[PDB]
Homo-oligomer: A and B are copies of this chain.
């Protein structure tokens, strides 16, 4: 036999960039405030898996590739 199995992954290519951010900002006054008292997630897989709990109270400004990846690739189970 000639069984062929080929999974894949997270191949990335950005290129160029020069994002320069935020420049030339005369006088501002950022006075943010964050205060949380909840958001308790959970997850209870039994047979299969790759649950992904996630909590945040951030400001969430993303420039390039701010992912929170979590991979689980090409699993198997026979129990012969």
Contact = CB atoms under 8 A, between A and B. Distances in A.
Given A4-B3, A26-B24, A58-B57, A73 B71 contact: yes
A6 B9 contact: no
B40 A40 contact: yes
A27 B26 CA distance: 5
Chain A residues touching B, range:
35 or more
Contacts of A7: 6-9, 73-74
Interface of A: 1-80
Given A12-B65, A62-B66, 18 more contacts: A2-B2, A3-B5, A14-B14, A21-B63, A27-B27, A32-B32, A32-B33, A39-B40, A46-B46, A48-B75, A49-B50, A50-B51, A55-B55, A59-B60, A64-B64, A66-B66, A67-B68, A71-B72
